Design a protein around this ligand. Sequence first.
Ligand code: MG
Ligand code: MG
Ligand code: ZN
Ligand code: ZN
Lengths: 333, 1362
Amino acid sequence: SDPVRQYLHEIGQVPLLTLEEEVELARKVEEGMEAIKKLSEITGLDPDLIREVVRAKILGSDPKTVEEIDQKLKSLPKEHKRYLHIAREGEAARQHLIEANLRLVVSIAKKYTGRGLSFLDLIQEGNQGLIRAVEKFEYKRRFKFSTYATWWIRQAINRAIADQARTIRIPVHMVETINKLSRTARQLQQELGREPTYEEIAEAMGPGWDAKRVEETLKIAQEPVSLETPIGDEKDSFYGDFIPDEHLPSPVDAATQSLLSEELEKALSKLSEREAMVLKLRKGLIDGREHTLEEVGAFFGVTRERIRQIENKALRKLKYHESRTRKLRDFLD
Amino acid sequence: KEVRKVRIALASPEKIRSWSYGEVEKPETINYRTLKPERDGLFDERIFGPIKDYECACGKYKRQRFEGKVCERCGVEVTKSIVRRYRMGHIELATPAAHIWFVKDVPSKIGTLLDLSATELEQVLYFSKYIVLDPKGAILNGVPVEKRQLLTDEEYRELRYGKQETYPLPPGVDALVKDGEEVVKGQELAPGVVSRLDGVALYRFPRRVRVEYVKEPKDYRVQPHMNVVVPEGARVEAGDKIVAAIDPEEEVIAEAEGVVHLHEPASILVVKARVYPFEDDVEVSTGDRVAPGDVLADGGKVKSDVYGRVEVDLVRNVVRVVESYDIDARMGAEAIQQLLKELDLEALEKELLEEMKHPSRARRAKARKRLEVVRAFLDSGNRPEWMILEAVPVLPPDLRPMVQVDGGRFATSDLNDLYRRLINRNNRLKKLLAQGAPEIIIRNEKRMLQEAVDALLDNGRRGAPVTNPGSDRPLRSLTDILSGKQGRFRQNLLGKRVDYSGRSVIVVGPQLKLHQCGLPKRMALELFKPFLLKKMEEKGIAPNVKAARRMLERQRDIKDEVWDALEEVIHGKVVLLNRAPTLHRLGIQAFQPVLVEGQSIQLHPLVCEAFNADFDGDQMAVHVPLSSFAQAEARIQMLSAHNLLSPASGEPLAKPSRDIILGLYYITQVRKEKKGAGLEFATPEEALAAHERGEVALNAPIKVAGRETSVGRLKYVFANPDEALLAVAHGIVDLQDVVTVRYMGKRLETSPGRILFARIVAEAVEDEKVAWELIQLDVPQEKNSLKDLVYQAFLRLGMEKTARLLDALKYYGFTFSTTSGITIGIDDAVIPEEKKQYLEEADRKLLQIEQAYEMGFLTDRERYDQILQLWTETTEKVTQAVFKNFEENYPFNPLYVMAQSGARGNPQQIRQLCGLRGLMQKPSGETFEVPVRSSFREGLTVLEYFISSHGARKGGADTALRTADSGYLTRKLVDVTHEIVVREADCGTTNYISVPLFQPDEVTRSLRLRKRADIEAGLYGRVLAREVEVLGVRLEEGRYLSMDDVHLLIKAAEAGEIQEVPVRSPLTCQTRYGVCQKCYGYDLSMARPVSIGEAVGIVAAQSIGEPGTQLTMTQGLPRVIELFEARRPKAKAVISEIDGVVRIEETEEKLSVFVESEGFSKEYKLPKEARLLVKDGDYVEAGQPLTRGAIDPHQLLEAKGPEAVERYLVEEIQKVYRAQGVKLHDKHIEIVVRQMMKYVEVTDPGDSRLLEGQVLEKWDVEALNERLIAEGKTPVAWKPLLMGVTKSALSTKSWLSAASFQNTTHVLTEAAIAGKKDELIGLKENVILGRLIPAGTGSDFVRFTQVVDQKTLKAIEEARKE
DNA sequence: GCATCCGTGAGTAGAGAAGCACAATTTAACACTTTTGTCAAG
DNA sequence: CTTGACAAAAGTGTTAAATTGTGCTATACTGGGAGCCGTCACGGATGC
Ligand SMILES: [Mg+2]
Ligand SMILES: [Mg+2]
Ligand SMILES: [Zn+2]
Ligand SMILES: [Zn+2]
């Protein structure tokens, strides 16, 4: 029932590496990676293609072509088959090197909890940085693995928080900007003994910052609120029960639109057969789209000035009719 | 076409992808700057649809002419924005995940198919244990591995990779063994360590290298950053590298030629492997898996002879094959999905049928559970592997909205966070798989993916609920949205908020008619606004509707002509008034609204009882029926003046109460005097002479010669009621003085008030002769008499005249109560002089108990019981003294008059005011020894008030918990009987029940006539099944039993001419999905045969549930609940399983009752403290209770049969309502009991496809048997089953109603797998779909009725047949 | 048979916590025609 | 009813700044954290 305890038990079955074992595994990965490069230069295929084929055999269990490429590599002579062996051992050493450092990520990941990601999310993201650490680690520098791996494990956790801890994703540059603003404000708060103002925070931030920018950054940093947040002691009301839907038209709005449509077509009946057609075509009352005097000059074969000539004349006659009946002004609001 | 059925089934991964308009690949929702949806996110317009109508995301298209077109740039279809409420997405999972409903809903559907327990399924699904799919010839602990075997992580690693362990050495020591030495278990590798396993031992990191040169040894040191490149014993030529290092300076090259010897290993790794030395190239490589006989290195010369994984060694020049097997064992839903894909349902069914023949009952029962699941998949066409998800459906974004509020902040649903977690974990798994991450990392990610799917579907079902950071609130998952009281079914489908509705405080409308209510004008303007806008446009108030609405927006712009138009709007229309809680149907009634100034609704006094409404702050909801159907239904079926009788009992529910009774009682009660009572005269003139001198009072009972009369009867003889009332108006006589009045041609010796009451009824009904027969003149008008008058007027005159009579009684009742002079003073609570005598007498006997207690004549408990009995008797005597004092000395006392008339108060409450408060109970339930000797008039002491406070708090706490229990019981009753509708006139059955007119009584051991109210509750309104001849009257078969017929049967029962009445009942009705008109009888609310289409099941549930809070709560409401739940009574009585003669054998150790028969000897080991109700020699029937207590309904079913338990359940439930005076007709219980006996259990399948022990409806097996008999096959043998209302409701065919009641996950899980098709038979299903319910006007029996005038009819006729 | 853990259910209204470097992608400011729309001319 | 020609409006192609995405830091660091609690009865299964 406890996924965290289950994971810790799983990583507890891989013993920690001694320094001699750490160097041997680190050496094999570098030798294996170099062996893959030598193989590709000779066999002519993609270096990335070969490492997947070598990795597939080590892991075990397109499968059609993996055997074909693996058989081709084994078809090489004795001198070239040797480089395949280091590639196999190097990939196997990489798997064991990663497995024996799964305790390091847990120690690092526990320092990042409470920042929007669960503990298991932090570990898995930290594992991704650990895998990248193995690829970029160099044992020639005689530095221990934990010294260099810690940088990549912390890097992967930080990037995941900046990318996955918010419902509305915010880029890393703005997340690091939001983090700086809070740190600066907190430092000003403890020194001034009160909540800093936006002018005070902007001045402490440095050049290019004013109270307007601080307020906009805080506005951006506002997390969305849950629609299922309860109100009151009783568990029978939420925020969503008090938020009206402003997208769908109301029955009143739908009705007055229909009322306007039938009164407008009734007024257009007084117009001529062609004069009413032009307005319905120019205003998009038929096709739904406003057409140009040109797009209308092709439907009827008339000049762009013909339309503008009558379209106004039909418009003027509706103005006279409206002033005589006044059955259309109330829709104007 | 019309929707007639709703089918639920499992969704295949292909079907889920068919629903989706695109795959949601990113967890992004909207841009933080533009606030517009992100591409490939949870709100993408390219997947779910445009944000606004007919506009693409880019903006190229913004018109409706491009409907159906997808923009080439943005990729968004140009269509209506409402498609975002319907268009779904999907998430392509990297690995399959199991659906939590089919895993955790006990019993597990996946586990049942795979024969896996809950623990075994949990371990595999959540990556704790492997399950074997292909052993590949693997052996574990000497036993070969079998398919479906569960392997732990340690066991799998031994089989998959092999057995090996490294043994560290103490620093500075050397290993005894050499590199590549075949060590065994227990052999010492080093002085301080021993190898715990047998295998090849090899050095890991030799710290010291000894090279013996050929010409001298040279001992070197190996740093931890150095590696030896040559093996032990290698021939190293001069200058060849021996130990490698990062820097060439530290490289240890050989000085000359020699042989390398490794020493001081860091550790020894003993691996159970076979070593194959080689000289030429190798045909395999590290990681390759070889079987015995596979060539390894030398082109055929070297070949493996054991299963294992190859690891080529480039320094030792050997090939080591670590003994291991290529076993195919997987974890998670992927392994489970493969098992269900390879599971043959047809083969499994045959095997399970064979196990069904096993003689063990448990084996057959277990096989039935599996075979029900197997047959569900086979019949529905569902494919079992669909219970594991490959594509996760994504809810449409508008159903999980992210909306900006007026403040500016965004609000989003919890599903978006649940979806983001799944996508974040799914995307990370894809990258981890692409990077070739170790299995441990992949295992954790897959386990987290399964939990992410579980949280989205049902958060908190397994493990800790997922919560958002910063709060402990669990995220609302899909299951939470649909289930519970706040779920979709109970909050938005079975009930909704409605338009055209209002609410206000209610006040009494004394001047209103029964069909009228007072509706505020301001409310009515809002309630009828759309109608008012049309009316304003018809008049000259406004030019059009839009201008009319603007006028009403501002109060100060509303003209007075608007209010006149509002009156024309509401003319003839009715509104619906509702007060919560709506315990019965008269909680909603239709009234014609009368516009009144003010903000309060005026309510008629006579409908307050039906609403359970008073005027101490109560509020009511107002609703406007819109169409002609809705208005016609309210004006005809729901009008208050059309609903005068209670549907539960048939008694008048709209009847005089409170002041109306008191005013009518005051004028109808006669005054009694005592000035000259009992004195005798000789002539009437002498009697009048004494009255003149004041010797005798006007109403004092006297005797003239030999007849008992009074002065008023002789002094005042009135020729007509008008003259008698004229004298009252002139002050000669009072309304309560007994005089002589000639009325109806008869010389009546009554009071003018009684004569006045007769005229009230006569003028109300506009018939003087009938009204004379309807009233009881010679009695004071109290609650019961007035109720009888209303019921009798209803039968003889109908609703319309009864409504006028009710209004007339209300008017005069209120008028006379005002002028009566009825008040409450402190002296009105008269303290009898007998209270002091009783208290002193009780004190003297109290000392007797204490004196005897000190003498040892009685124990502590005997003293406690004696004191309680003493005070209980003293309390009762004071109650008699209080009412006796009122009866003889203050006949018109306010408290006495209110109690006798039935207006307010009961004798228990009157005693607490005028006598003594009485005994009080401690919080533990024990009664205090000392009672509260003071009444409320005298005033309690401080201690007495605190002592009485325990009971008051206990009663209030009981009331609060009883309402929840009563409301829960009502919902169970509704959900089990909602489908019961009167669907036909007659089902044609000849079966019936016999209502007993006599019951056994234990105190006399004989049959005693039952109470009249009890006989009426079981006989009123019922259709006679057989012809009955009683008292020379022939009651034909099919006759509806009226109240007169019931009274005739009771009179015949007292004459010994009849003992039981054969009547048709719902228990014996053969109608499918309901009852027939004949088997139901009267519509108690109309005192006439029920109309086809009435939802009597809903009425029955409300009738039973409405008085639930009035029960005192084995007693009260808990007794009712266990009876309807068919629960086994805790103090279960013991009933004889067979008939015979009981033979008691009492001993000092135990008790044993033997029911001796002709050849049967049954045994029952009754406890010592068992209250036996039978003696030796008595002949007992099967199922007869040997011991007192509640009978187990299920034991009675198997002992005596279905009819016995049905009559037991109805009788026992009735007993509870009888104790509280609640009158409930037996029909309502029998409808529920009919549903409790609806299912049966198969005992012998015969020649059918059913299973022994299978539960199905009684109708189905009877229908199935008819076809089997019609073709000569063996019919199915079955036995009756009894289940509670909860279980019966959850086993109904329709999954929509069952899912909306309880166990939504369980109901939907079984329905989807079985592919159930809801036929929309009951009321709840059509409510969910918003369809017309098949009851009332929606019933097919009346729904298709046409109406036409003669002119149109003849025109159609004359035009066709011409 | 029995004892135990898990799952289910328990009235209705209303009111209420890293920088930094650099590349890669997008936005916004320009210019540019090119296009409708329009007021003279018959 | 056509010029017609003409300015505004709109479209369009560059180019710049701005915003956003990604990689990388080398002493050594290697199994978490919060809860933990006053209901009661009821199936139903799961084993004993
Ligand atoms: Mg009240
Ligand atoms: Mg006289
Ligand atoms: Zn577009
Ligand atoms: Zn019937």
